Design a protein around this ligand. Structure first.
Ligand SMILES: Cc1ncc(COP(=O)(O)O)c(C=O)c1O
Ligand SMILES: Cc1ncc(COP(=O)(O)O)c(CN)c1O
Ligand SMILES: N[C@@H](Cc1ccc(O)cc1)C(=O)O
Lengths: 393, 392
C-alpha cells in the first residue's frame, strides 16, 4: 500500500555536489564538452603489479568460499609491516587493525561504534562533507571546528566552548587536508591527542592523502604520544594506489575501538574477497617508488596549472602542501562559491567544486583537483580566459 | 582515557554463528582434524568462466577508479534479464534493483531502511539467526511467526495477534528454507502479499536458496501479483554460484524500497569493484548447466547422507525439499541442541549447527550442511557411530 522509509532515510543529508553532476549530464546531452576538475577520482590506472596480484589470487579456490569475518591475517600483517616501513609506527596486527570496504564505509562503521544519539561530534569547517552522513545516521549533533588560513587550517582546540566537551564524544581530523591542501605535524597531533584524552573524546584521523605531502614525509597521527590511547587512523587504498574503484580501507589504532568495529562488522559482513585482500597486500608490500612517482606527477600538474592560471588569467593560487587539490579564492566580484562555480560551468563548461559544499568557511574558495591530464588542465585555463574575469583584483 | 563503545555495540544480540565458529576454531587449535558441516560454506569452486570474467575485467582501467554509486547498468540489466529468464518476472533495471556486498549486508541495510525504533518486525521461528541483528540494531521489536512441520513450515498469518499488526513494519520470509528445507509456492506468496498489503507490512523475501528446489521449479516471491507492491526479494550469489567469498547480492522489487536502499548506500556502501560486477554479470548470463549440475550434486549428497545415517545410526531424518541442509532431531538424552552439538564436536570431531540458534522451535534439532563430498560425509557418520547414541 504505502511504502514508508525509516527516519534515518528521511533525515539523510542532501548530497549537494550530486546536483551539479546532474546538471552536467543535462548539459553533456545538449552538446556541451565539459572539463571536470571537480572530483577526486584518480585518472591514472592501478599499478600493474597490484592488478596481477588480484588476477593470480582469484584462481585460488580457497578464496571462493567464506573467509574469516575479520579478514585474512596475511593482510593485517601487511598493514602492520606497512605502518612500520612508512611511519615508524608499531601496530599489533591481531588487535589493532580492522578492514573496511573503502573509507566511506569505515567512517559509517566508526561513527556507529562511537556515537550515541544525542552525542556531539566535533567536525572541521571546511571539511569532507561525508563526515556529516555518519554523524546524522548516528542521530548525533555536529559542532564545528573552524579552520582558518591564519592558523594553517589547523583547529584551535581552546576556541571550543567547554560547555560541549562533555557531550563531545568524537572528533574528525583530516591531514593532508581535503579541501585546503594543508598539512599537520607530530606536535599538532600530540596536542590533539592530549586534548581528546582530557575531555574523553574519541579521535578519528582521516589519512586518505597520507602518501601526498610534497616537502616531506607525512606524519601519521599514530606517531603522537597517546594517539593510540584516544583514537584510530583511517587509511584508504583509493588515493595512494589509484584503487578508488576497488573499495578498500583499514583502521589502525586503539584496540578497544578496533574491538567495537569488529563486533559491529561481525553482524554485517563476512570479510571481503580474498583476491582483493591479496591485491591490497601486494599494494602495501610493493615498491614505494611507484607512489613517489605518482606524487611527482601530481606536483608537476600543480606547478604547471598554478603557473598557467597566474600567467594566463591573473589568478594567483597558493600551492598546496599536500593532496592533489588546489584551494583557490574566487573573484571578489562574486559573493559566493556556488555563484562562481555556476558561472564557470555555464560560460566555460568547466567544473570546479564550490568551497561551501565543505561548510560555511569555504564560501569564498573553490576546490580544483589535479586528477586530469596536462591538456585538460590547459583547456580549462583556455576556456576561462575567454570570460575575462577580474582575478587580478 | 576511557574508550566508550556506543549503545548499539553494548546491546548487540548474540552473534550465534560467530560463537559456533569460534568453538570450531578452538577445537581445531588442539590439532584435531574436523569435518565441518556447520556453516553453509560451498566446498566446490567458483565456475571458471566467472573467475575468468573477473580476471579480464580487472585489466579495464575504468574499474580502477570510482564508478556509479548505485552500480553499473550492465549488471542491473543482467539481473533483470536473469529474473525474466528464470522466474518470468519483469524488473526495471533502472529503478527496481539494488546491489549489496552479500546477502548478510543486504539484511542489515534493509532493516535500517525500513524500521524505526519501536517498530515491530515479523520473523519466522525457526529462522535465519541474522535477521535478529539488523532488527536489534534498528531498536525494533521482534515478533515470531512459528513455522510448524504440520503446516509445511509455512507461517499461518491469521494466527498473528491483530494488536501487533499496527506496529508491524517488516516481515522476513525464506523459501527454500534455512534451516528446515521447506519450500513455498505461488499461492503462498500471493497469500503473503495480500496479508502484507492489508496491514501495511514491508515484505522481504530471502531467496538465497532459490536455485535449489529439487522437485518443483522454484518460485520467486515476485511471481505473485501484489508482491512488488509490498516488498522485495534478496538474491545472493553465494550459494547459486559457489561465490560465498566474493560477497555479492542484490535486491529486486518495489521501487520505493529500492529508492530508500539507494539513498542509504549512497552515503555508506557504494558500488563494489567493477571487476566483481562483471564477474557477477557473467554468472547470471552463463549457461544454467553448471547450476543444475550443482543442484544434482547436493541432491545425491542428501540421498546418500540420510540413508547412511538411518542404516548406521538409526538416525531418521526427513529429506529436505530444498537447500543443502538436513534438519535432524537430537537424542532424548540431551537437554539442549548446544549440548548435543558440543558433544559431537568434542567426541566425534564433527561440526553440526545447534538448532536453538534458529529460535526456540529449533531447540531439539541440529542443522547439517551437505558441503563436503560423499566420502567425507561417510567419515562424519563413522565418527558419530563410535559414540553409540540413542538416535532412535
Ligand atoms: C577526505 C577524504 N577521506 C576519505 C576518502 C576515502 O574515500 P574512499 O576510501 O571511500 O574511496 C577521501 C576520498 C577523501 O577525500
Ligand atoms: C537464509 C540466508 N540468508 C542470507 C544469507 C547470507 O548469505 P551471503 O551473505 O553469503 O549472501 C544466508 C547464507 N548464510 C542464508 O542462508
Ligand atoms: C550459511 C553461511 C553463513 C552463516 C553465517 C554468516 O554470518 C555468514 C554466512 C549458513 O547459514 O551457515
Amino acid at each position: 500500500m504505502e511504502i514508508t522509509p525509516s527516519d534515518v532515510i528521511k533525515t539523510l543529508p542532501r548530497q549537494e555536489f550530486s546536483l551539479v553532476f546532474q546538471k552536467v549530464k543535462e548539459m553533456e546531452k545538449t552538446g556541451a564538452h565539459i572539463i571536470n576538475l571537480g572530483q577526486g577520482n584518480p585518472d591514472l590506472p592501478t599499478p600493474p603489479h597490484i592488478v596481477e596480484a588480484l588476477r593470480e589470487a582469484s584462481l585460488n579456490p580457497s578464496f571462493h568460499g567464506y573467509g574469516p569475518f575479520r579478514g585474512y591475517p596475511f593482510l593485517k600483517e601487511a598493514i602492520a609491516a606497512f605502518y612500520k616501513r612508512e611511519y615508524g609506527v608499531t601496530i599489533n596486527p591481531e588487535t589493532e587493525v580492522a578492514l573496511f570496504g573503502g573509507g566511506k564505509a569505515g567512517l559509517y562503521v566508526l561513527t556507529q561504534c562511537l556515537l550515541n544519539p544525542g552525542d556531539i561530534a566535533l567536525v572541521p569547517n571546511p571539511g569532507y562533507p561525508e563526515y556529516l552522513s555518519g554523524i546524522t545516521m548516528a542521530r548525533a549533533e555536529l559542532y564545528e571546528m573552524p579552520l582558518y588560513e591564519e592558523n594553517g587550517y589547523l583547529p584551535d582546540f581552546e576556541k571550543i566552548d567547554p560547555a560541549v566537551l562533555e557531550k563531545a564524544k568524537l572528533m574528525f581530523l583530516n591531514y593532508p587536508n581535503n579541501p585546503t591542501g594543508a598539512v599537520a605535524d607530530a606536535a599538532f597531533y600530540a596536542k590533539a591527542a592530549a586534548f581528546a584524552k582530557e575531555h574523553n573524546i574519541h579521535l578519528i584521523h582521516d589519512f586518505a592523502y597520507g602518501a601526498f605531502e610534497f616537502d616531506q614525509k607525512p606524519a601519521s597521527f599514530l606517531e603522537a604520544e597517546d594517539a593510540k590511547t584516544v583514537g584510530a587512523e583511517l587509511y584508504s587504498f583509493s588515493k595512494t594506489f589509484n584503487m578508488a574503484g576497488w573499495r578498500m580501507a583499514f583502521a589502525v589504532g586503539n584496540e578497544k575501538i578496533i574491538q567495537a568495529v569488529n563486533e559491529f562488522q561481525d553482524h554485517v559482513f563476512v570479510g571481503m574477497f580474498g583476491g582483493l585482500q591479496q591485491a591490497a597486500s601486494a599494494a602495501l608490500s610493493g615498491d614505494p617508488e611507484h607512489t613517489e612517482s605518482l606524487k611527482r606527477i601530481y606536483k608537476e600538474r600543480i606547478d604547471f596549472f598554478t603557473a598557467l592560471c597566474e600567467k594566463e588569467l591573473g589568478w594567483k593560487m597558493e600551492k598546496p602542501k599536500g593532496t592533489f587539490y588546489v584551494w583557490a579564492e574566487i573573484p571578489n566580484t562574486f559573493e559566493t562559491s556556488h555563484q562562481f562555480s555556476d558561472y564557470l560551468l555555464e560560460h566555460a563548461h568547466v567544473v570546479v567544486t564550490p568551497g561551501e559544499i565543505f561548510g560555511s568557511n569555504g564560501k569564498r574558495h573553490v576546490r580544483i583537483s589535479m586528477v586530469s591530464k596536462q591538456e585538460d588542465l590547459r583547456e580549462f585555463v583556455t576556456r576561462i580566459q575567454k570570460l575575462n574575469l577580474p582575478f587580478g583584483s
